Amino acid sequence: QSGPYLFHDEFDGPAGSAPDSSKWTVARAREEMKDPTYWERPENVGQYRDDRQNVFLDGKSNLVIRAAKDGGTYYAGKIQSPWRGGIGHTWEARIKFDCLTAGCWPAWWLGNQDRGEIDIIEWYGNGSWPSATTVHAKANGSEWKTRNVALDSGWHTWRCQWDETGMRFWQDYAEGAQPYFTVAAHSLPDWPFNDPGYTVFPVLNLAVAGSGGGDPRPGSYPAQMLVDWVRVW
Ligand SMILES: [Mg+2]
Ligand SMILES: [Mg+2]
């Protein structure tokens, strides 16, 4: 866990800095949702923009993703690395969720363009869905293994070891610790992760509204997610 790293960002630099553009691309728009339900409609959904008001470094070694209303619209943020990694590595981020409020939908996850998703941790502000770690096999998202995870606003590390045997997850890993969830390889239909050449990219985001965020009006904004580092080894 001390490296050397295949990929890392320590998010160091002065307050108000952009994240390192050699490691991240900042989202400029929320993913459009076909046949939107109420909180997914264009007029209700939270947006993403590359604006230092929403995605910036705090000068204390953290990425800040900040959700806030600006002229009738909630804006927040997402960063995704162009860097992709294959099977057989460990992926970890140190995160503080100061955004566990109605409407928010933060996540730390590993993505793929075509099939498969590893949601290392995610919280739902909609008032209905439980915070959880989830592995998805199908693009529809509709085949998954999930485990609910109790979340607070403290600092924690969130680790996924993704190797040929599957995925193992830890919160606040320390020597000898037991994963809180394990997903066996080949345990979902058309499991994609063991395919030769399959890769994932790291993503950090704080969304507002949409399906998972729901109504932000009961929430308290601005709200933030802090990330001290992402490390892959
Ligand atoms: Mg690789
Ligand atoms: Mg840091």
Tab-separated table of C-alpha atoms and ligand atoms in Angstrom:
chain	number	residue	atom	x	y	z
A	1	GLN	CA	0.000	0.000	0.000
A	2	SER	CA	3.038	2.323	0.316
A	3	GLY	CA	3.792	1.661	-3.361
A	4	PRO	CA	5.457	2.136	-5.792
A	5	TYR	CA	2.126	2.788	-7.567
A	6	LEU	CA	0.851	1.900	-11.012
A	7	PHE	CA	-1.258	5.074	-10.665
A	8	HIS	CA	-1.723	7.579	-7.884
A	9	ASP	CA	-2.766	11.108	-7.141
A	10	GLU	CA	-2.110	12.664	-3.758
A	11	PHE	CA	-4.089	15.810	-4.682
A	12	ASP	CA	-1.339	18.063	-3.442
A	13	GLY	CA	-1.093	21.697	-4.388
A	14	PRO	CA	-2.354	25.093	-3.338
A	15	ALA	CA	-5.958	25.889	-2.505
A	16	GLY	CA	-8.101	26.613	-5.520
A	17	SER	CA	-5.931	24.499	-7.923
A	18	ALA	CA	-7.457	22.251	-10.549
A	19	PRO	CA	-6.894	18.541	-10.248
A	20	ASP	CA	-3.862	17.312	-12.208
A	21	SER	CA	-4.925	17.254	-15.850
A	22	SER	CA	-2.363	14.556	-16.626
A	23	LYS	CA	-4.347	12.235	-14.339
A	24	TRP	CA	-7.971	13.387	-14.586
A	25	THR	CA	-10.614	14.651	-16.942
A	26	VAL	CA	-13.310	16.751	-15.322
A	27	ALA	CA	-16.897	16.105	-16.401
A	28	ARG	CA	-18.552	18.952	-18.277
A	29	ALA	CA	-22.072	17.565	-18.240
A	30	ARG	CA	-24.281	15.079	-16.376
A	31	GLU	CA	-24.854	11.842	-18.297
A	32	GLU	CA	-28.181	12.246	-20.176
A	33	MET	CA	-30.824	9.757	-18.986
A	34	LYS	CA	-33.148	8.264	-21.601
A	35	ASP	CA	-36.816	8.253	-20.544
A	36	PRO	CA	-36.064	10.227	-17.394
A	37	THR	CA	-38.028	9.868	-14.168
A	38	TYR	CA	-38.755	13.040	-12.180
A	39	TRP	CA	-35.346	13.670	-10.591
A	40	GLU	CA	-33.600	12.665	-13.849
A	41	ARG	CA	-35.457	15.236	-15.968
A	42	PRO	CA	-33.208	17.932	-17.458
A	43	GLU	CA	-34.800	20.643	-15.307
A	44	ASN	CA	-34.442	18.660	-12.042
A	45	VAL	CA	-31.173	16.737	-12.392
A	46	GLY	CA	-27.925	17.961	-10.866
A	47	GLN	CA	-25.332	19.019	-13.393
A	48	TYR	CA	-21.595	18.639	-13.700
A	49	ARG	CA	-19.245	21.372	-14.873
A	50	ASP	CA	-15.470	21.956	-14.913
A	51	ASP	CA	-15.484	24.921	-12.685
A	52	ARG	CA	-13.175	25.589	-9.771
A	53	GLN	CA	-16.245	26.233	-7.731
A	54	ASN	CA	-17.162	22.558	-7.987
A	55	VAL	CA	-13.894	20.625	-8.509
A	56	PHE	CA	-10.744	21.973	-6.866
A	57	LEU	CA	-7.903	21.190	-4.466
A	58	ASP	CA	-8.154	22.502	-0.915
A	59	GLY	CA	-4.454	23.071	-0.224
A	60	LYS	CA	-4.537	20.389	2.449
A	61	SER	CA	-3.847	17.448	0.125
A	62	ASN	CA	-7.488	16.900	-0.837
A	63	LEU	CA	-9.613	16.994	-3.924
A	64	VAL	CA	-12.875	18.735	-3.155
A	65	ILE	CA	-15.978	17.934	-5.126
A	66	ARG	CA	-18.560	20.513	-4.089
A	67	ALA	CA	-22.317	20.470	-4.754
A	68	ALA	CA	-24.081	23.832	-4.646
A	69	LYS	CA	-27.027	25.618	-6.166
A	70	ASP	CA	-26.153	28.332	-8.696
A	71	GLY	CA	-29.065	30.159	-10.376
A	72	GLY	CA	-31.798	27.521	-9.874
A	73	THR	CA	-29.551	24.591	-10.793
A	74	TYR	CA	-27.425	22.335	-8.660
A	75	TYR	CA	-23.917	21.828	-9.934
A	76	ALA	CA	-21.425	19.302	-8.605
A	77	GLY	CA	-18.607	17.323	-10.163
A	78	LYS	CA	-16.973	14.205	-11.452
A	79	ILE	CA	-13.408	13.318	-12.329
A	80	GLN	CA	-12.438	10.244	-14.361
A	81	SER	CA	-8.900	9.189	-15.206
A	82	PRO	CA	-7.870	8.254	-18.716
A	83	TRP	CA	-5.570	5.784	-17.004
A	84	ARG	CA	-6.806	2.224	-17.148
A	85	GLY	CA	-5.654	-0.802	-15.216
A	86	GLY	CA	-6.170	-4.499	-15.750
A	87	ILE	CA	-6.770	-7.380	-13.402
A	88	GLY	CA	-4.477	-8.248	-10.495
A	89	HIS	CA	-4.193	-4.898	-8.658
A	90	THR	CA	-5.420	-3.117	-5.564
A	91	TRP	CA	-7.284	0.203	-5.792
A	92	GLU	CA	-7.773	2.473	-2.799
A	93	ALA	CA	-9.006	5.978	-2.026
A	94	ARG	CA	-9.051	7.986	1.183
A	95	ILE	CA	-12.368	9.851	1.367
A	96	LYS	CA	-14.383	12.054	3.681
A	97	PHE	CA	-18.093	12.302	2.834
A	98	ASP	CA	-19.254	15.721	4.067
A	99	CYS	CA	-22.181	15.307	1.680
A	100	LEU	CA	-24.448	12.698	3.283
A	101	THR	CA	-27.483	14.921	2.755
A	102	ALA	CA	-30.724	14.540	0.793
A	103	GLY	CA	-30.178	14.843	-2.939
A	104	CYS	CA	-26.509	13.878	-2.903
A	105	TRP	CA	-25.091	10.795	-4.581
A	106	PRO	CA	-21.336	10.408	-4.051
A	107	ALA	CA	-19.335	7.492	-5.396
A	108	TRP	CA	-15.856	6.000	-5.728
A	109	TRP	CA	-15.901	3.458	-8.531
A	110	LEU	CA	-14.047	1.725	-11.338
A	111	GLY	CA	-15.696	1.995	-14.741
A	112	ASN	CA	-15.722	0.433	-18.170
A	113	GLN	CA	-17.113	1.831	-21.430
A	114	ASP	CA	-18.919	-1.346	-22.428
A	115	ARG	CA	-19.653	-3.832	-19.624
A	116	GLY	CA	-18.993	-4.071	-15.915
A	117	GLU	CA	-18.713	-1.626	-13.052
A	118	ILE	CA	-17.145	-1.814	-9.611
A	119	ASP	CA	-18.886	0.590	-7.211
A	120	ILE	CA	-16.422	0.528	-4.356
A	121	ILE	CA	-18.635	2.763	-2.228
A	122	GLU	CA	-21.685	4.834	-2.983
A	123	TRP	CA	-24.320	6.635	-0.959
A	124	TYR	CA	-27.829	7.535	-2.029
A	125	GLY	CA	-29.573	10.741	-1.015
A	126	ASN	CA	-32.965	9.768	-2.386
A	127	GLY	CA	-34.293	8.554	0.975
A	128	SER	CA	-34.938	4.983	-0.275
A	129	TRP	CA	-31.791	3.179	-1.364
A	130	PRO	CA	-29.098	1.946	1.050
A	131	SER	CA	-25.407	2.885	0.770
A	132	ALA	CA	-23.478	-0.057	-0.567
A	133	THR	CA	-20.635	-1.655	-2.475
A	134	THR	CA	-21.746	-3.277	-5.733
A	135	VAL	CA	-20.225	-5.206	-8.633
A	136	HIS	CA	-22.211	-5.063	-11.878
A	137	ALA	CA	-21.718	-7.349	-14.854
A	138	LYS	CA	-24.109	-6.111	-17.446
A	139	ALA	CA	-24.229	-2.676	-19.105
A	140	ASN	CA	-27.885	-2.346	-18.133
A	141	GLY	CA	-26.408	-2.587	-14.654
A	142	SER	CA	-29.025	-5.287	-14.012
A	143	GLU	CA	-26.880	-8.202	-12.818
A	144	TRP	CA	-25.064	-7.453	-9.589
A	145	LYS	CA	-23.675	-8.528	-6.260
A	146	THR	CA	-24.149	-5.931	-3.508
A	147	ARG	CA	-23.447	-5.424	0.171
A	148	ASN	CA	-24.880	-2.640	2.264
A	149	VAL	CA	-22.266	-0.510	4.022
A	150	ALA	CA	-22.967	1.820	6.953
A	151	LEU	CA	-21.462	5.262	6.220
A	152	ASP	CA	-20.550	8.233	8.359
A	153	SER	CA	-18.773	11.499	7.612
A	154	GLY	CA	-15.390	10.439	8.997
A	155	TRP	CA	-12.194	9.889	7.051
A	156	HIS	CA	-11.909	6.351	5.717
A	157	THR	CA	-9.992	4.355	3.155
A	158	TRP	CA	-11.954	2.298	0.637
A	159	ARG	CA	-10.020	-0.554	-0.978
A	160	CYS	CA	-10.810	-3.014	-3.742
A	161	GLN	CA	-8.472	-5.868	-4.606
A	162	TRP	CA	-9.542	-7.008	-8.060
A	163	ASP	CA	-7.713	-10.168	-9.162
A	164	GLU	CA	-8.469	-13.356	-11.066
A	165	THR	CA	-10.402	-14.745	-8.076
A	166	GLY	CA	-12.789	-11.752	-7.909
A	167	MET	CA	-13.088	-8.633	-5.779
A	168	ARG	CA	-12.428	-8.089	-2.106
A	169	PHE	CA	-13.278	-4.875	-0.302
A	170	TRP	CA	-11.985	-3.255	2.885
A	171	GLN	CA	-12.767	-0.149	4.860
A	172	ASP	CA	-9.753	1.283	6.734
A	173	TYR	CA	-7.503	-1.596	5.774
A	174	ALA	CA	-4.810	-2.496	8.247
A	175	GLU	CA	-2.507	-5.504	8.559
A	176	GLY	CA	-4.443	-8.738	8.784
A	177	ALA	CA	-7.849	-7.144	8.216
A	178	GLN	CA	-10.837	-9.096	6.827
A	179	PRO	CA	-12.678	-7.837	3.756
A	180	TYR	CA	-16.252	-6.752	4.480
A	181	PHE	CA	-17.378	-8.081	1.094
A	182	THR	CA	-16.090	-10.538	-1.432
A	183	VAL	CA	-17.405	-11.142	-4.918
A	184	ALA	CA	-16.243	-14.358	-6.538
A	185	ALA	CA	-15.145	-14.342	-10.163
A	186	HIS	CA	-17.724	-15.894	-12.502
A	187	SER	CA	-20.553	-15.283	-10.033
A	188	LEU	CA	-22.657	-13.146	-12.396
A	189	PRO	CA	-23.957	-13.888	-15.881
A	190	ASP	CA	-21.441	-13.086	-18.636
A	191	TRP	CA	-18.947	-11.954	-16.004
A	192	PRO	CA	-16.649	-9.612	-18.024
A	193	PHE	CA	-13.797	-8.970	-15.592
A	194	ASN	CA	-11.637	-12.017	-16.367
A	195	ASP	CA	-11.635	-11.375	-20.109
A	196	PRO	CA	-8.131	-11.014	-21.566
A	197	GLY	CA	-7.330	-7.303	-21.812
A	198	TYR	CA	-10.281	-6.069	-19.743
A	199	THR	CA	-9.504	-2.779	-17.984
A	200	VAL	CA	-11.174	-0.265	-15.721
A	201	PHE	CA	-10.634	3.419	-14.975
A	202	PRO	CA	-10.996	5.179	-11.626
A	203	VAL	CA	-13.840	7.650	-11.032
A	204	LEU	CA	-14.757	9.995	-8.201
A	205	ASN	CA	-18.001	11.922	-8.292
A	206	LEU	CA	-20.630	13.710	-6.299
A	207	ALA	CA	-23.899	13.836	-8.194
A	208	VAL	CA	-27.054	15.699	-7.143
A	209	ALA	CA	-30.514	14.321	-7.877
A	210	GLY	CA	-31.010	11.759	-10.647
A	211	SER	CA	-32.323	8.393	-9.631
A	212	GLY	CA	-29.945	7.827	-6.738
A	213	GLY	CA	-29.798	11.393	-5.406
A	214	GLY	CA	-33.521	12.186	-5.543
A	215	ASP	CA	-34.971	15.351	-4.059
A	216	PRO	CA	-32.331	17.810	-2.801
A	217	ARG	CA	-34.801	20.159	-1.087
A	218	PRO	CA	-34.576	18.382	2.286
A	219	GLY	CA	-30.774	18.560	2.067
A	220	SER	CA	-28.222	21.088	3.284
A	221	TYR	CA	-26.051	22.681	0.564
A	222	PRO	CA	-23.297	23.401	-0.253
A	223	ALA	CA	-22.086	19.860	0.456
A	224	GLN	CA	-18.644	18.365	-0.247
A	225	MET	CA	-16.691	15.191	-0.718
A	226	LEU	CA	-12.985	15.297	0.117
A	227	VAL	CA	-10.478	12.849	-1.355
A	228	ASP	CA	-6.931	12.776	0.004
A	229	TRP	CA	-5.607	10.279	-2.518
A	230	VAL	CA	-6.254	7.541	-5.064
A	231	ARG	CA	-3.643	4.773	-5.231
A	232	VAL	CA	-3.364	1.672	-7.416
A	233	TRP	CA	-0.654	-0.960	-7.002
B	1	MG	MG	-2.476	-2.788	-16.152
B	2	MG	MG	-3.729	14.010	-0.541
